[PDB]
Amino acid sequence: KNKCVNFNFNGLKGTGVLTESNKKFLPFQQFGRDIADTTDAVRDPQTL
Amino acid sequence: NKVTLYGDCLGDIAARDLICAQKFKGLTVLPPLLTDEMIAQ
Numbered sequence: 001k002n003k004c005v006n007f008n009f010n011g012l013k014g015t016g017v018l019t020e021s022n023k024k025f026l027p028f029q030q031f032g033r034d035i036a037d038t039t040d041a042v043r044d045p046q047t048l
Numbered sequence: 049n050k051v052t053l054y055g056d057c058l059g060d061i062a063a064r065d066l067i068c069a070q071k072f073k074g075l076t077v078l079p080p081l082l083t084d085e086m087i088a089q
């Protein structure tokens with residue numbers, strides 16, 4: 001966390017800093033999408 | 049007053065700003081050469 005990483009969360013490739021998120025996801029929700037439809041938050045699979 | 053115009057936008061994940069999202073999609077706003085103090089002078 002707080003570092004640039006080539007991330008592969010549940011098969012979603014990306015390059016970005018990852019930080020703790022205030023946003024709360026409902027159990028069905030696993031990913032968060034912004035206006036541009038680019039994932040802005042991901043729930044970690046190993047730790048929810 | 050009548051007309052309303054990285055570390056800031058990194059900590060702006062709790063709030064939502066259209067300037068931070070425009071910066072993160074590569075669309076930045078350059079400042080003018082003359083400030084408001086100089087247009088006023």
Ligand SMILES: *[C@@H]1O[C@H](CO)[C@@H](O)[C@H](O)[C@H]1NC(C)=O
Nearest residue numbers: 027030043044045046047048
């Ligand atoms: C996955 O394993 C880690 C390491 O033991 C543990 O901390 C975490 O709670 C586990 N998650 C689930 C959903 O079992």
